[PDB]
Amino acid sequence: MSRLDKSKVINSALELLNEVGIEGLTTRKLAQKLGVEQPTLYWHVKNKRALLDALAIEMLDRHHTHFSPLEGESWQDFLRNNAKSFRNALLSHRDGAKVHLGTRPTEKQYETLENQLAFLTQQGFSLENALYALSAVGHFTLGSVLEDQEHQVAKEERETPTTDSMPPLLRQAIELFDHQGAEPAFLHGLESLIRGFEVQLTALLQIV
Amino acid sequence: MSRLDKSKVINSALELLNEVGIEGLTTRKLAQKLGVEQPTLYWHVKNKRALLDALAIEMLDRHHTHFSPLEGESWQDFLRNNAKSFRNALLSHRDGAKVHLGTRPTEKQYETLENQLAFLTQQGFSLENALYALSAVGHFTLGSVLEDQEHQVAKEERETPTTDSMPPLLRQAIELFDHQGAEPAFLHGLESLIRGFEVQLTALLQIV
């Protein structure tokens, strides 16, 4: 209970998560890793679900640090930096995005939602459009990360066809994604969404 | 083996999937539902993983019917209709999107990828931008559906705070999403992405 300080159980869980993925993670494997009996760990942590909720929240604490607008930030810059920040959280551990999936939102998060809307609307968005914008940026980001993370968890047993059986376009696509990874695609898409809203908001009174 | 025709095992699995979700789905529960011994079912279906691959593909066969460009369709219309179609597939069964997650792509799908690129590039996209566009529309769509589907699988035990403890913006947001559901947000975001690429492609030789 130094061994079982909340912050040490959290760190152990994170390291386990990286070792075995969300699949493998069990309260049992945590008990062995910490070197304690299962009922001792059960006093602190009821089940796999309660443990994930804590992992989800921790990841967001450490890394999702741009969750509100900086003093006189434009809404475009805010949306962009908030999406990047949320993404750094999801990526910070193996299966980050699945861990995040289905965990309840905390009270401070609701409050943050509220401010995020106050801000956007004070920049001239209708409430409808503010919600559509935060929603789209979030889906896009979440979707980016599940795919990227599904890769190296499917990397183990399955494999791709060899690079040289491919039709020639697909073959240049491999070269290209080899060189850049996935960050540039994410950034490009983020930037297209934000541009598309910009054309949206410039609509204001009429047709586009 | 009328009871165990491939198409009857598939339909049974789909119905089971709706009853218990991806979590609950086991080859064992399938054996009981079909009324056969587990080793008889095991002759046809090796494991949970092989079964999901078949469910993923079936869903896409039945519903993802707009996977290539219609005779003289514009690329905007194509992107839009393809995203909608992929989405109808994911939504067609409980946990559709998770089922889809990690399943290998079939040979015809690679071939379809290739045509989709041939088309976009023949409409004046660079190969880089064609890939960024298909990628963003896909992430966004996948992300939309996991969230929408996570809801009614978390609906069971957990509940939201009551509508009347909310700050007033959040409270109008509830009204609004009550009335429209989630389709309109998806359509709006799809349409913003596509607009954002449009500003992209109009760049062509210069700065935007």
Partner: peptide, 13 residues
């Protein structure tokens, strides 16, 4: 690396 991205994209067809 590249092989997996195209795998992702092909999956959605």
């Amino acid at each position: 690396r590249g092989r997996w991205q195209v795998w992702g994209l092909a999956k959605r067809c």
